[PDB]
Protein backbone atom coordinates (compact mmCIF):
# COMPACT_ATOMS: atom_id res chain seq x y z
CA UNK A 1 0.00 0.00 0.00
CA UNK A 2 3.22 2.18 0.02
CA UNK A 3 3.13 5.06 -2.31
CA UNK A 4 5.87 4.12 -5.19
CA UNK A 5 6.61 5.56 -8.06
CA UNK A 6 6.45 3.25 -11.54
CA UNK A 7 10.33 3.90 -11.51
CA UNK A 8 10.56 2.72 -7.99
CA UNK A 9 8.46 0.17 -8.50
CA UNK A 10 10.75 -1.16 -12.00
CA UNK A 11 14.00 -0.97 -9.58
CA UNK A 12 12.04 -3.17 -6.78
CA UNK A 13 11.03 -5.21 -8.81
CA UNK A 14 15.03 -5.79 -10.60
CA UNK A 15 16.14 -5.40 -6.74
CA UNK A 16 13.91 -8.97 -5.54
CA UNK A 17 14.83 -10.46 -8.73
CA UNK A 18 18.84 -10.37 -8.13
CA UNK A 19 20.06 -7.60 -10.09
CA UNK A 20 23.08 -5.57 -8.74
CA UNK A 21 23.24 -1.59 -9.26
CA UNK A 22 25.37 -1.80 -11.93
CA UNK A 23 23.07 -4.47 -13.86
CA UNK A 24 19.98 -2.03 -13.53
CA UNK A 25 21.81 0.98 -14.90
CA UNK A 26 22.67 -0.90 -17.68
CA UNK A 27 19.09 -2.40 -18.39
CA UNK A 28 17.22 1.19 -18.01
CA UNK A 29 19.96 3.45 -19.73
CA UNK A 30 20.89 5.29 -16.91
CA UNK A 31 23.81 6.38 -14.70
CA UNK A 32 24.56 4.28 -11.88
CA UNK A 33 24.26 7.35 -9.26
CA UNK A 34 20.89 7.57 -10.28
CA UNK A 35 20.15 4.03 -9.12
CA UNK A 36 21.36 4.38 -5.70
CA UNK A 37 19.67 7.70 -5.35
CA UNK A 38 16.39 5.60 -6.54
CA UNK A 39 17.43 2.93 -4.29
CA UNK A 40 17.77 4.93 -1.12
CA UNK A 41 14.20 6.66 -2.21
CA UNK A 42 12.88 3.15 -2.56
CA UNK A 43 14.07 1.83 0.92
CA UNK A 44 13.13 5.01 2.60
CA UNK A 45 9.87 4.05 1.56
CA UNK A 46 9.12 1.33 2.62
CA UNK A 47 11.38 2.15 5.79
CA UNK A 48 8.54 4.41 6.79
CA UNK A 49 5.79 2.02 5.38
CA UNK A 50 6.89 -0.79 7.94
CA UNK A 51 6.92 1.83 11.03
CA UNK A 52 3.95 3.33 10.06
CA UNK A 53 2.61 -0.25 10.02
CA UNK A 54 4.32 -1.64 13.34
CA UNK A 55 2.55 1.90 14.73
CA UNK A 56 -0.37 1.26 14.05
CA UNK A 57 -0.89 -2.58 15.83
CA UNK A 58 0.90 -1.09 18.58
CA UNK A 59 -2.02 1.65 18.58
CA UNK A 60 -4.15 -1.72 18.22
CA UNK A 61 -2.69 -4.07 20.28
CA UNK A 62 -2.32 -1.06 22.81
CA UNK A 63 1.37 -1.54 23.86
CA UNK A 64 4.78 0.40 23.92
CA UNK B 1 15.39 -12.12 19.74
CA UNK B 2 12.82 -11.15 22.77
CA UNK B 3 11.08 -14.45 24.78
CA UNK B 4 8.00 -13.75 27.23
CA UNK B 5 6.79 -16.42 30.04
CA UNK B 6 3.37 -17.67 28.99
CA UNK B 7 -0.25 -18.07 30.46
CA UNK B 8 -0.27 -20.37 33.24
CA UNK B 9 -2.67 -23.17 33.03
CA UNK B 10 -5.35 -21.55 35.39
CA UNK B 11 -4.88 -18.47 33.28
CA UNK B 12 -6.14 -20.17 30.28
CA UNK B 13 -9.00 -21.53 31.28
CA UNK B 14 -10.43 -17.51 32.77
CA UNK B 15 -9.82 -16.58 29.52
CA UNK B 16 -11.47 -19.04 28.25
CA UNK B 17 -14.41 -18.86 30.56
CA UNK B 18 -14.19 -14.80 29.51
CA UNK B 19 -14.49 -15.90 26.34
CA UNK B 20 -17.30 -17.45 26.61
CA UNK B 21 -19.29 -14.58 27.81
CA UNK B 22 -18.83 -15.39 31.41
CA UNK B 23 -18.68 -12.19 33.75
CA UNK B 24 -16.49 -12.11 36.74
CA UNK B 25 -18.61 -13.17 39.38
CA UNK B 26 -20.01 -16.17 37.32
CA UNK B 27 -16.54 -17.02 36.89
CA UNK B 28 -15.51 -16.94 40.99
CA UNK B 29 -18.70 -19.10 41.32
CA UNK B 30 -17.99 -21.37 38.95
CA UNK B 31 -14.23 -22.00 40.35
CA UNK B 32 -15.51 -21.66 44.00
CA UNK B 33 -12.47 -18.79 44.22
CA UNK B 34 -12.83 -15.20 45.66
CA UNK B 35 -13.85 -12.40 43.18
CA UNK B 36 -10.67 -10.77 44.22
CA UNK B 37 -8.52 -13.63 43.08
CA UNK B 38 -10.48 -13.48 39.53
CA UNK B 39 -9.92 -10.19 38.68
CA UNK B 40 -5.81 -10.85 40.00
CA UNK B 41 -5.93 -13.92 37.62
CA UNK B 42 -7.53 -11.39 34.94
CA UNK B 43 -5.14 -8.54 35.55
CA UNK B 44 -1.88 -10.90 35.20
CA UNK B 45 -3.73 -12.54 32.01
CA UNK B 46 -3.91 -9.15 29.90
CA UNK B 47 -0.21 -7.99 31.22
CA UNK B 48 1.39 -11.19 29.91
CA UNK B 49 -0.82 -10.77 26.47
CA UNK B 50 0.49 -7.06 26.64
CA UNK B 51 4.07 -8.58 27.22
CA UNK B 52 3.50 -11.32 24.20
CA UNK B 53 2.26 -8.59 21.85
CA UNK B 54 5.01 -6.02 22.69
CA UNK B 55 8.21 -8.77 22.44
CA UNK B 56 6.39 -9.59 18.96
CA UNK B 57 6.47 -5.80 17.46
CA UNK B 58 9.99 -5.13 18.88
CA UNK B 59 10.94 -8.63 17.37
CA UNK B 60 9.32 -7.70 14.11
CA UNK B 61 11.01 -4.40 14.10
CA UNK B 62 14.13 -5.52 14.59
CA UNK B 63 14.03 -7.80 11.80
CA UNK B 64 12.76 -5.29 9.89
CA UNK B 65 15.24 -2.29 10.43
CA UNK B 66 12.94 0.06 11.87
CA UNK B 67 13.57 2.71 14.98
Redesign the interface.
Known sequence: EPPLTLRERQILKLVAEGKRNRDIAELLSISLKTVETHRLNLMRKL?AH??AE?SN??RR????
Do not use: C, S, T
Open positions: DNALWALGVL
